[PDB]
Design a protein around this nucleic acid. Structure first.
Lengths: 113, 127, 96, 98, 79, 150
RNA sequence: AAAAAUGUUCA
RNA sequence: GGUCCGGCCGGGAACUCAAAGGAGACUGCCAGUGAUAAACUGGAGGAAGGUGGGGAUGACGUCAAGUCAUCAUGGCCCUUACGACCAGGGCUACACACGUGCUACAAUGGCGCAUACAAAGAGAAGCGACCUCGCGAGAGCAAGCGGACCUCAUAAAGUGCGUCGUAGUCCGGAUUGGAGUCUGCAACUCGACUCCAUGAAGUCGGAAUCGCUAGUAAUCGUGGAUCAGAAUGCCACGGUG
RNA sequence: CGAAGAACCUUACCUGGUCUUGACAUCCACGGAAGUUUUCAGAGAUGAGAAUGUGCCUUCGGGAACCGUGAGACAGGUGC
């Protein structure tokens, strides 16, 4: 379905379909379905639009989508304003959280020659 | 009980008291397929039993401990025919030459210093 | 050797359980994870002095940390030396 | 009743010179226990034989420390005189109970 | 890392702070220490934190919701 | 070398009575383990049974003992001159080799499961979908037409 | 019985 | 026999186990072969034959091999110091290159359920059940054991079922955000663990290259040391194979 | 790989505070039971203090341990 706005994957069980799509991941998937008493292994092929009403409510108790995606970037730049060990580091995107600062940094610092 | 058997094969030793009674395999109040899940193992230890045909005429209790899954069944296979060389001494030959009072000595070997396993050592390269 | 490096190391152990350990350990509920009360708390962070987390176990005949064995209270070689000569009851070469 | 724990290194020691207290105790007490084994609480080490590098050679150690404990059990509490003051033995953990 | 079940204070050089908030600071404290929670209420100062060879004045910034001195000083210097 | 070196004999499959079937579990050995191997053996065996009420065992046997390997090139001395000698293969080792190959051929046919592979695969006996037909056109191509000797 | 060099000075 | 049905009770030492002392294998016998020589190949019997299987043992020596920093030491050198004592920082840069590892790329698998069987060690500033709370990491509360007693302790692949269908996905897990646990006075450089969120690269790897002959390879866990507190490391143990 | 665990401390390296018969050894002389709990300032090392303890033996002087100071012969150096 879509929830009500933005497409999510179709013809697939409801826990699947909820996915990782900004503040609703794996844990949030089945937790939400369990919560609103709708069955977990309802495909969008099998998805009712009475199911659809109780759905939307439970995802509104979490900061999800575009809304979520602001706050986060405001806070990564927070630390830099400070000029933190985490701070400054982001200007060339050097590891902050665990990872070597010498080497092995292909997917954070960028790659070798 | 009227015939006993040891049989310690693949680190599992199994008591055997062959009792008077009738063909059945009672082992820890169960069967094979009941003390274990799906098995290949179950068929293998019945192989001496069809070899000249028994277990329709005596009853047996088995109490295997430790070791393997196959290793347990190793012990079962070993002790039954170390109690059926003494039920029959005519098949004394037909059990030692049929390799059922033969102890398996392929046992797991120990790790060493500077080696990854029992013989395994590191790979080397430079490219 | 290095007599000097060693000498240091020794004295840490006196204070370790004479001006620390039950002087310092006096924290109770109100200063650990059970409960909190800033009064007591900040004035028992106030002394630091000696500390056993600033003490290594050490070899008592080298004082290096590398290749240490608690079990004999000495380092690598200062086990092996004794042990080869057959001084110590029942240590033997692996042979099973 | 009494637990008697003999725990010593060598078999030439947990088995030898240890019969001298089983002896004297028969008369004073009223029973003896023979030398019952125990699963043997043992060690093995490794120390790097080199003084620098070469981890291809490390001296690999073992050490059985045998446990036959004997463990004479006595409701007879007159055993103690000839048991413990009288007889003596070293190299062996000597431990007594009630 | 974490202050555990309920908080710590993290006393490290809290013998100068109580002197230097009685006329404020504006003057560079020669400080070896690199740890101590900077409190959001202990701001407008000039801390010369060490990096092991130079004490560098760093003007404290407002709203420090839980941070160290250490995080605001050089540690080793790039090409 | 100076001794012929082999090892212990494996046991015949005990719930179909057949050593060949047990040596083909070994071929499919996955995680080091016979267990998860035997499943698929048996799964695809049934597939074959449905299409073939008679033995479905003679579509392994025919296919692979049509193929008769013979070629390699070595050299040995003879009368004081070495010569480049072509060497024949003994009929036993032809067998031994051939049984393996067909079952080796699976896990590359780009299916979903080893069902659909080994089923459709094994059924053929001389019109193979397995490596058995594909080695024919190399073995006899070579031999005695680009091989100067037995 | 399947091509193929070259090795700064000094115990 | 009893049974709170649980080796739960007495009871019996048979049994497995434990662990001290033995029995045995010696080409010893049997045939053939071989200079009638030594000896070899089969055969038997056996748990085991022809250096049974697995350790530990490196000759006379060579490499002026490594190691004055484990330690020892000849000479040399420093002497309000190449000495000494303390606080902070570094040894965890980085613009590259390489060694040694770990993890996947998936249904011969992944996930959800329930379930099967191990071995060997650890331990009184010690291991810490239990029971309470905590989704959780874990915190409280507190027994037991000087450990064939009690605690660490709970094997994992495997197995039967539920499902997903070969998608970079329900694969895979990097990165990062936010919130926490714990060891320590204290974790910013440079401590480990958890919760959630974000969700990568990788679609089984070129030229080239390596190990391994049997319970070996393969694979699945497990424990120990070190250690205040840092294992994809080292050391050790069994399952399957 | 030496290193079966580099926060500080360790750790030799670095920057800074600080000392020079010494941090570590022996021996001689001087003073003082050793110590105990405490103040201030300093990053600490420490420096400068406030009270308190008057032990072990004596052959009564003397010692025994130990603390501070004095002084060298010496000492120190994981330095080559």
């Amino acid at each position: 379905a879509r929830i009500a706005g933005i497409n999510i994957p179709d013809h697939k069980h409801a826990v699947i379909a909820l996915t990782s799509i900004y503040g609703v991941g794996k844990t949030r998937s089945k937790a939400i379905l369990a919560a609103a008493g709708i069955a977990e292994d309802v495909k969008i092929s099998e998805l009712s639009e009475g199911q659809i009403d109780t759905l939307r409510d439970e995802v509104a108790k979490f900061v999800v989508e575009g809304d979520l995606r602001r706050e986060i970037s405001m806070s990564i730049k927070r630390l830099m304003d400070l000029g933190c060990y985490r701070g400054l580091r982001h200007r060339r995107g050097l590891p902050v959280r665990g990872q070597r600062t010498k080497t092995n940094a292909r997917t954070r610092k960028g790659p070798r020659k | 009980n009227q015939y006993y058997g040891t049989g310690r094969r693949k680190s599992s030793a199994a008591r055997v008291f062959i009792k008077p009674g009738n063909g059945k395999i009672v082992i820890n109040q169960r069967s094979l397929e009941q003390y274990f899940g799906r098995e290949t193992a179950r068929m293998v230890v019945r192989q001496p039993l069809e070899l000249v045909d028994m277990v329709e005429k005596l009853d047996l209790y088995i109490t295997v401990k430790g070791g393997g899954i196959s290793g347990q069944a190793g012990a079962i296979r070993h002790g039954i025919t170390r109690a059926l060389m003494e039920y029959d001494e005519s098949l004394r030959s037909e059990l030692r030459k049929a390799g059922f009072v033969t102890r398996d000595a392929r046992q797991v070997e120990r790790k060493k210093v500077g080696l990854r396993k029992a013989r395994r050592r590191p790979q080397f390269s430079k490219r | 050797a290095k007599q000097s490096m060693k000498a240091r190391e020794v004295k840490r152990v006196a204070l370790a359980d004479k001006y620390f350990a039950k002087r310092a350990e006096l924290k109770a509920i109100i200063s650990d994870v059970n409960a909190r009360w800033n009064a007591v708390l900040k004035l028992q962070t106030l002394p630091r002095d000696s500390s056993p987390s600033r003490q290594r176990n050490r070899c008592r005949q080298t004082g290096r940390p590398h290749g240490f064995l608690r079990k004999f209270g000495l380092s690598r070689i200062k086990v092996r030396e004794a042990a080869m000569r057959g001084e110590i009851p029942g240590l033997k070469k692996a042979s099973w | 009743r009494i637990r008697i724990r003999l725990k010593a290194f060598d078999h030439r020691l947990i088995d030898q010179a240890t019969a001298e207290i089983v002896e004297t105790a028969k008369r004073t007490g009223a029973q003896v226990r023979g030398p019952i084994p125990l699963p043997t609480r043992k060690e093995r080490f490794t120390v790097l034989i080199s003084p620098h590098v070469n981890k291809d050679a490390r001296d690999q150690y073992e050490i059985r420390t045998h446990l036959r404990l004997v463990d004479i059990v006595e409701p007879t509490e007159k055993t103690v005189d000839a048991l413990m003051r009288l007889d003596l033995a070293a190299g062996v953990d000597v431990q007594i109970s009630l | 890392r974490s202050l555990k079940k309920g908080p710590f204070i993290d006393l490290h050089l809290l013998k100068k702070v109580e002197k230097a908030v009685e006329s404020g600071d504006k003057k560079p404290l020669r400080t070896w220490s690199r740890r101590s929670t900077i409190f959001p209420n202990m701001i407008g100062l000039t801390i010369a934190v060490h990096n092991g060879r130079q004490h560098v004045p760093v003007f404290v910034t407002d709203e420090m919701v839980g941070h160290k001195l250490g995080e605001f000083a050089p540690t080793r210097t790039y090409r | 070398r100076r001794r012929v070196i082999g090892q212990r004999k494996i046991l015949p499959d005990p719930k179909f009575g057949s050593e060949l079937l047990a040596k083909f579990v070994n071929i499919l050995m996955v995680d080091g383990k016979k267990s998860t191997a035997e499943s698929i053996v048996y799964s695809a065996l049934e597939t074959l049974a449905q299409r073939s009420g008679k033995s479905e065992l003679e579509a392994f046997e025919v296919a692979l003992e049509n193929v008769r390997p013979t070629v390699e090139v070595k050299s040995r001395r003879v009368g004081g001159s070495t010569y480049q000698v072509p060497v024949e293969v003994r009929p036993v080792r032809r067998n031994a080799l051939a049984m393996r190959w067909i079952v080796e051929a699976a896990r590359k046919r780009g299916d979903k499961s080893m069902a659909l592979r080994l089923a459709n695969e094994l059924s053929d006996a001389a019109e193979n979908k397995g490596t058995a037909v594909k080695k024919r056109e190399d073995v006899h191509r070579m031999a005695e037409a680009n091989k100067a000797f037995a």
